[PDB]
Write a protein that binds this ligand. Structure first.
Ligand SMILES: O=C(Nc1cccnc1)c1cc(C(=O)c2c(F)cccc2Br)c[nH]1
Length: 160
């Protein structure tokens, strides 16, 4: 696991509902507005691993974290995302393929000691959608998650 996390960049992904996360866990894909797509695509080219750490708002927990497998691609079968009020699929950028590293949950109470230096040292659970997490802080956060024996780490390693 630590090899997968080496020198990774971590991003806090705040979904407004559980459905979108369930979709992401079932289909291994993710999407977002173009401006955020551009940052993720640029970060994928330049970083050894791009880890998304998911947290559904109000849930009090992280729902897991996944690693970008590639830049975003267009022209796929439409996914039934639950989008913010007033957003349509036409406003979305492409779709990202993601390999889940851990699908198990982590409550905020087990991360109360981890503070994000890149967000005024507030607890890592606190942050806006997209807030980047400092390397060591993000690494420790991922290591607090329960082990998930259902994930094939070699499938993700071969893509690095
Ligand atoms: O990707 C997201 N945010 C970010 C910001 C900045 C950089 N990287 C990433 C993000 C997507 C969401 C969504 O609910 C969402 C989704 F699940 C699927 C499709 C579109 C949408 Br909209 C929340 N947050």
């Amino acid at each position: 696991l630590k090899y997968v996390l080496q020198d990774a960049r971590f991003f806090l992904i705040k979904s407004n509902n559980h459905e979108n996360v369930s979709l992401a866990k079932a289909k291994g894909v993710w999407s977002t507005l173009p401006v955020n797509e551009k940052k993720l695509n640029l970060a994928f080219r330049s970083a050894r691993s791009v880890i998304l750490i998911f947290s559904v708002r109000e849930s009090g927990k992280f729902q897991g974290f996944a690693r970008l497998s590639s830049e975003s691609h267009h022209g796929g079968s439409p996914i039934h995302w639950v989008l913010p009020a007033g957003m349509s699929a036409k406003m979305l950028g492409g779709v990202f393929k993601i390999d889940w590293i851990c699908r198990r949950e982590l409550p905020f109470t087990k991360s109360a000691h981890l503070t994000n230096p890149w967000n005024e040292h507030k607890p890592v659970k606190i942050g806006r959608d997209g807030q980047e997490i400092e390397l060591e802080c993000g690494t420790q956060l991922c290591l607090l998650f329960p082990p998930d024996e259902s994930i094939d780490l070699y499938q993700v390693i071969h893509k690095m």
